[PDB]
Design a protein around this ligand. Structure first.
Ligand SMILES: CC(=O)N[C@H]1[C@H]([C@H](O)[C@H](O)CO)O[C@@](O)(C(=O)O)C[C@@H]1O
Ligand SMILES: *[C@@H]1O[C@H](CO)[C@@H](O)[C@H](O)[C@H]1NC(C)=O
Ligand SMILES: *[C@@H]1O[C@H](CO)[C@@H](O)[C@H](O)[C@H]1NC(C)=O
Lengths: 319, 172
């Protein structure tokens, strides 16, 4: 009446603290961190297709600014846009800037299709010293500065392009704003100027704005950029009596747009990861991360907590 | 935990037990010994690793979203964009906080329960040949050599073999 058998459980010298509904410090034998709080100091070029803007933000790359030539034909899942990007062309603005930028990034590719526009009696291919391309006055290589005659004349323009292709087209066009009233007349005869771009079910009318702005790259004139989307079976009409910055063609729009843009200075490396933050790629299986709300791809969910420990063992009661 | 075994009538764990989560410690005429119980251990591990896999499971495959960082304020539209993201983050942070507390509460009850199931299993094996001492241990009222002990641990113990000896030791 003396043998004894005891039933028990393991323990370690020092366990890990976790939280329950009742207690915020329960020591358990093992635990697993669920919040990823470490990132790589680089972006992973695979398996997602990253395209480095380098000196060009995505707007300039679409416009065809000097230095943005490499971005031609580029296709991306994620467009990497650098904080230290610089304007290298004619001073401009975009009324709905973020919207155009969004459309370009989501679209996921820079596939330009050159087209013929037989304008008028006009001088085409106008250039500028604000947009130098290796020593020479130049311009946005996707845009065409129209500016009147040797014989002092730019009549009414009015050209039509009918989209009978199988894809939606993106036309980017602009309107030039002169500085005084000597201006326009010797860039653009008529006064006031004006552009009307329209489709079957749409329109857009812009009156230029003359006034003198600060000098940027040695100019006080500006160009405002716009865009028009032409669905298959629709068309587009360019109506102008002055100040039009004509397009040289159209960008092709993917039917389904799955791409995006990430603005960061982080360099592109050699690693493999499908989750990218503006602080760098994440390499993790954890369900949460506290590194950045700005996260693209296949990522853990962003949360505020720096740590959340999941118990993977029983309570630790050593000795 | 709910069953009062771990950190309960079992006063502490065994650092000496390194090849199992639960086990047996015995003392008889020819010595002492500690041995792991695989069934109880595996049952606990299966339920916890089961949690883990349901946890790491989740896509969250997001590409084009909204702007989330701003140089200068613009007003109404920016306010909304910020509010939406802030609202999202709070809700997901709450989800994360509650999930872990729920899982951990449950994991602790599960391991407490598995400890108790092992104890109860052995209790039922022993029938009238032993008495609960109150600390997770049974006093066995008959000679039980190493083979007898092992028969208890591997489920082949036949209480009728020793019942006459045990009954006599218990009540007289
Ligand atoms: C087509 C054309 O002739 N553009 C000329 C422009 C524009 O007239 C003004 O910039 C409008 O603001 O002015 C320049 O000094 C410039 O910018 O380099 C010379 C350039 O040749
Ligand atoms: C030119 O404009 C006229 C009306 O002003 C219109 O009927 C015609 O379709 C236009 N043609 C082109 C090529 O734009
Ligand atoms: C994320 O959590 C870690 C600790 O796990 C902390 O050091 C870091 O500062 C946190 N990052 C934040 C709050 O942005």
């Amino acid at each position: 009446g003396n043998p004894v058998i005891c039933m028990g459980h393991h323990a370690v010298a020092n366990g890990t603290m976790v939280k329950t509904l009742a207690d915020d410090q329960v020591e358990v034998v093992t635990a697993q961190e669920l919040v990823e709080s470490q990132n790589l100091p680089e972006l992973c070029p695979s398996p997602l297709r990253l395209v480095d803007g380098q000196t060009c933000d995505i707007i300039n790359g679409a416009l065809g600014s000097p230095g943005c030539d490499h971005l031609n034909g580029a296709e991306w899942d994620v467009f990497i846009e650098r904080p230290n990007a610089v304007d290298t062309c004619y001073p401009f603005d975009v009324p709905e800037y973020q919207s155009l930028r969004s459309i370009l990034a989501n679209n996921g590719k820079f596939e330009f299709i050159a087209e013929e526009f037989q304008w008028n009696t006009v001088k085409q291919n106008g250039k500028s010293g604000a947009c130098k391309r290796a020593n020479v006055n130049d311009f946005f290589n996707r845009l065409n500065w129209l500016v009147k005659s040797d014989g002092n004349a730019y009549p009414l323009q009015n050209l039509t392009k009918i989209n009978n292709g199988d894809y939606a087209r993106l036309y980017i066009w602009g309107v030039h704003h002169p500085s005084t009233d000597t201006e326009q007349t010797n860039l653009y005869k008529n006064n006031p100027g004006g552009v009307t771009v329209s489709t079957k079910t749409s329109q857009t009318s812009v009156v230029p704005n003359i006034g003198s702005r600060p000098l940027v790259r040695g100019q006080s004139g500006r160009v405002s950029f716009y865009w028009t989307i032409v669905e298959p079976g629709d068309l587009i009409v360019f109506n102008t009596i002055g100040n039009l910055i004509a397009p040289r063609g159209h960008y092709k729009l993917n039917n389904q747009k799955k791409s995006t843009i990430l603005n960061t200075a982080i360099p592109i490396g050699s690693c493999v990861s499908k989750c990218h933050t503006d602080k760098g790629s994440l390499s993790t299986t954890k369900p949460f991360q506290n590194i950045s709300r700005i996260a693209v791809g296949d990522c853990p969910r962003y949360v505020k907590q720096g740590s959340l420990k999941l118990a993977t063992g029983m309570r630790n009661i050593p000795e | 935990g709910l069953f009062g075994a771990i950190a309960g009538f079992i006063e502490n764990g065994w650092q000496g037990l390194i090849d199992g989560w639960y086990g047996f410690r015995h003392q008889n005429a020819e010595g002492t010994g500690t041995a792991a119980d695989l069934k109880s251990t595996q049952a606990a591990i299966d339920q916890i690793n089961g949690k883990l896999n349901r946890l790491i499971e989740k896509t969250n495959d997001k590409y084009h979203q909204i702007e989330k960082e701003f140089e200068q304020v613009e007003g109404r539209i920016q306010d909304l964009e910020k509010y939406v993201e802030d609202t999202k983050i709070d809700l997901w942070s709450y989800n994360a906080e509650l999930l872990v507390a729920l899982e951990n509460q449950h994991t602790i009850d599960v391991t407490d329960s598995e400890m108790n199931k092992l104890f109860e299993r052995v209790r039922r094996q022993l029938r009238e040949n032993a008495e609960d001492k109150g600390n997770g241990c049974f006093e066995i009222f008959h000679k039980c050599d190493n083979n007898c002990i092992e028969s208890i641990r591997n489920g082949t113990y036949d209480h009728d073999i020793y019942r006459d000896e045990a009954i006599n030791n218990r009540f007289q």
